[PDB]
Design a binder for this molecule. Structure first.
Ligand SMILES: Oc1cccc(F)c1O
Ligand SMILES: Oc1cccc(F)c1O
Ligand SMILES: Oc1cccc(F)c1O
Ligand SMILES: Oc1cccc(F)c1O
Ligand SMILES: [Ca+2]
Ligand SMILES: [Ca+2]
Ligand SMILES: [Ca+2]
Ligand SMILES: [Ca+2]
Ligand SMILES: [Fe+3]
Ligand SMILES: [Fe+3]
Ligand SMILES: [Fe+3]
Ligand SMILES: [Fe+3]
Lengths: 314, 314, 314, 314
């Protein structure tokens, strides 16, 4: 029972044509529908559900909500009960609130982000099929992202005022949603303050992550690539499409995953993440990164925490 | 609750010095202990428990038993109860039956293989540590296998006599151990016979697998590599060590994982498996491979099922 | 002055539609013209001359001739003079003998193969251009071969009758065409017999190569890929196109280049060759491979000389 | 006849212990001798001559001279004659001027750099040998650089005063040393000014290169790696050794080679260069990069010419 994986992310964009162009041509996603309000829904080739990205017209960037898929419909009642015993109030949006989407349990994380849980979303299949499938499909576009992998949320954090919603979110998704902590960044005196946490339901290093900030927001959504080579191809694609790069190809110290940071035309940050890294396990020790090695935890090859990683988000 | 991953495999070898030489120099494992009976225990660099491979002196090759680790000690009683309601009789070997190993629930699969479940094994840590760790350790040897990944068991199968322990094992580990089926090979009239199944507890394509055969036995144990490049390095290592190759570097149609098959000095087959392949999920459709494409399911690049894959095992 | 590189290879095929389909879809070549006799001319994306492959209608497989490009027109007279002082008779086919091709110096190697040298061939450019070019072009097809890299010729060899045209060809292209020997396979008593030689004009390990055989013929023509990863992609392409594989992805001991052997629909062997391997240099020692390690020289990962490598050619 | 490749580079360092530590541990070179004046000589594993790097004690960074190897001793007289007809005065340092080094023709490039040509240097062999060699050697250290690949020299350039030693060096090495131009960066009105040129004697994209600057100096020396994957490993090595990175892993638009820029402990810039890129050929069109795309020519993935690439050198 419980949460399976990240289901979709709903983003604000200011130019729909340019944004759809970006997620199709750069990341290789496909548009699957547009609702009557102008929202556009896209999926990756190696996902089987209708969509993992919602683009909504807006006058600003940022995130509307984040959705995770659960195994069965009955999980929603059980998780709703645990969430409310913890002190978080929930609502249940019914079927068709979002097109091709079943009912959704809705609530706010302690950091203030809206999170939804759904059990049912329209099946459409991967672009390779499930009867004698090819390992990859022809006509793949751009970086050819496999699937939406995880989301890093900036969480309001003010330790000298007793506010650390990174810690509160971490406690919340572990106790209520039964995520387990895989890696953490410890700052403050003797590493007494959790400033960044990575948590999983799958056996990958992270399906959700939180990083401290002056306010709450969206750091990035991430898409999976197979290998370091695909990261090279993806970087070649971003050059051909005049994409604005945040961080050039390098490796994360945390998770060991090779990565590129870049921006969509509205300013939301995207990541192409390469490799499993390691098999996340509930009996595995939590990987701890300390403040003196804070740079290598994010950008391992340089040990230099970019000013853009910690200052720029939507 | 429940099974986490494959825990260890206990193999028969006829030359201990040569076998230990093989798993250390070719796969990069490290010997962690030798018990009073001459059994040798080895682990991979990216595992944190004491051992994943047991080598036992013998006059033949083959497998003694297969062990999977569960999340907590109380899972053993719960799983024991389910297993026995299904019709399989169990025993509980207590702590220290194997050195550095907690109590073990022991039973036979329908195919006749001995399977054990344990919750407790001595922690020793990975060779990179868990405080500001490097992505890989210096002094890595041979192919530098990350961890024991899965095991493919040959299962007695005689359809015209009503015997298919591949199907019986598949039903057993799903109903009792709550594995889920990720991929299957269908043969016989219209694909009405399961001849090969791949099943998971992690979100990787397989942690156990069964393939039909005239008798039951061990097809191979497999070790994880990161990338296709590491497969090249591993093949270079096998050449330097005069390893007997079964199948040269290629890709599996099933799981999409890139692979090499080769033999230890006693004849047991090993595999170096590269890549995640895809994120296995309980809501993902089961990938079905048919008999006409049976060759591409195992050796995707040639479409040629090696006579050694289906005739040679221990 | 002198020879620059391999220029084109003219092959016999029995099904033109199927053969053109193969070189376009599998190797990623493009048809550039068809002459009035039905011959088809193809080039690779990273070549700038009109064509590197000629397909000619026939009732059998094999090679018509092999062509190398020289730096300037005046080289043809100088090389003609050296060739004839050596004892080989030459002719000069004038402009337009082949479409879009300048005059050609024609002669037979000691092994009997027809070889041509040309200075002039119509320029058409690479598919990426030469003003701010991309590293690779969009719409790349199949394996996306960069260029025709080299050709291995089977050369009549009967040592107990005093016939070794591998040695005679090797002496010929070194003394007359100023190739230099990079690697050799030595067989017979104490390695006293040259059975395979690799020779270069570029600073790559080989632009031409000779291997002994009961008769003279074509072993394969080869196309360059960048990386080991591209070899994986190429093998994936061959599976999608139901290509007949000779040797699955592995590494050559000679040259260190990673490779795949496979067949066109008429039976001619092709190779996708990955990597520089090393910088070939006139002051570099000749790499010598001995008969006991003859298997590793060709298929390094297995040490097993395929019966098809030494029995099957056209 | 003529120049074969870059032979060695002699660098100034301020801390010999730290510098030798860097070239051994980070790049994987080996110290082969130290002369009576404290100069240290190192080679790469895939070079066969005694050394390719000289470290000389100094109170500053920078380059002493640059040396290229020629095919035969008689080339030195012929090249000396051409060089002096051009207007450059030469001297001939005799055998043993440098240890294990034959006589050297010495002269200044128009940009003022000292250049030497030698025909003879002590042979010691590669670390894999030349009889049935492995593709790579065991005990490889750090990034495992194959060989010193090329050198980029900053050349005094003041167009509004009629000074462009990039153009003068380019004309010099082409007319006198018979290099050929492979790629150029064109700036100024309509691209009328050569600001960067890449020139070859091998069939690789460059063995020497010049870039304009306010003064003349050393931009970097470069070492060859096989693949994009080795660039990842090299970046992992630099992190483990706390190396100061200039540019994180990315691809060059020019040459198509994947690259990392970083510094030795004295401030000299090094590069780990991956891949052939393309086969450089005397009949290949010169790749032209324009000023509007000047950023992509150096750092292709971002299109952002680092301020450090054009401001920092020794
Ligand atoms: O995906 C990530 C893995 C490790 C560290 C990060 F900041 C990431 O975004
Ligand atoms: O690990 C494997 C994945 C797919 C097919 C197989 F036969 C395997 O051993
Ligand atoms: O391209 C080749 C390199 C080494 C050995 C061979 F047989 C080849 O075809
Ligand atoms: O090695 C190089 C290739 C292309 C451009 C550069 F700046 C280089 O250093
Ligand atoms: Ca994940
Ligand atoms: Ca697994
Ligand atoms: Ca070549
Ligand atoms: Ca070069
Ligand atoms: Fe991320
Ligand atoms: Fe396997
Ligand atoms: Fe070849
Ligand atoms: Fe460079």
């Amino acid at each position: 029972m419980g949460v399976l994986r990240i289901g979709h992310a709903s983003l604000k964009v200011m130019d729909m044509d340019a944004a759809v162009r970006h997620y199709e041509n750069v990341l290789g996603m496909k548009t699957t529908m547009k609702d009557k309000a102008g929202n556009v829904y896209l999926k990756c080739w190696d996902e089987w559900d209708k969509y993992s990205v919602i683009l909504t017209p807006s006058d600003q960037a940022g995130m509307n909500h984040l959705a995770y898929k659960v195994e069965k419909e009955a999980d929603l009642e059980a998780l709703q009960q645990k969430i409310e015993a913890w002190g978080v109030k929930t609502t249940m949006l019914d079927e068709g609130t979002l097109p091709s989407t079943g009912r959704m349990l809705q609530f706010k994380l302690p950091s203030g982000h809206e999170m939804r849980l759904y059990a049912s979303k329209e099946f459409v299949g991967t672009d390779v099929g499930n009867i004698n499938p090819d390992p990859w499909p022809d006509g793949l576009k751009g970086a050819g992202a496999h699937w939406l992998d995880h989301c890093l949320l900036v969480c309001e954090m003010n330790p000298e005022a007793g506010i650390n919603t990174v810690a509160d979110n971490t406690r919340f998704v572990t106790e209520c949603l039964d995520f387990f902590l895989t890696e953490q960044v410890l700052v403050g005196p003797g590493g007494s303050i959790q400033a960044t946490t990575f948590l999983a339901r799958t056996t990958t290093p992270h399906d959700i992550a939180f990083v401290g900030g002056p306010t709450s927001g969206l750091h990035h959504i991430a898409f999976f690539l197979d290998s370091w080579h695909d990261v090279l191809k993806a970087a070649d694609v971003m050059a051909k499409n005049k994409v604005r790069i945040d961080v050039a190809p390098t490796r994360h110290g945390i998770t060991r995953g090779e990565t590129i940071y870049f921006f969509d035309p509205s300013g939301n940050r995207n990541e192409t993440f390469a490799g499993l890294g390691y098999l996340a396990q509930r009996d595995r020790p939590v990987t701890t990164w300390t403040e003196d090695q804070l740079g290598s935890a994010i950008f391992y090859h340089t040990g230099y925490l970019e000013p853009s990683f910690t200052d720029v988000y939507t």
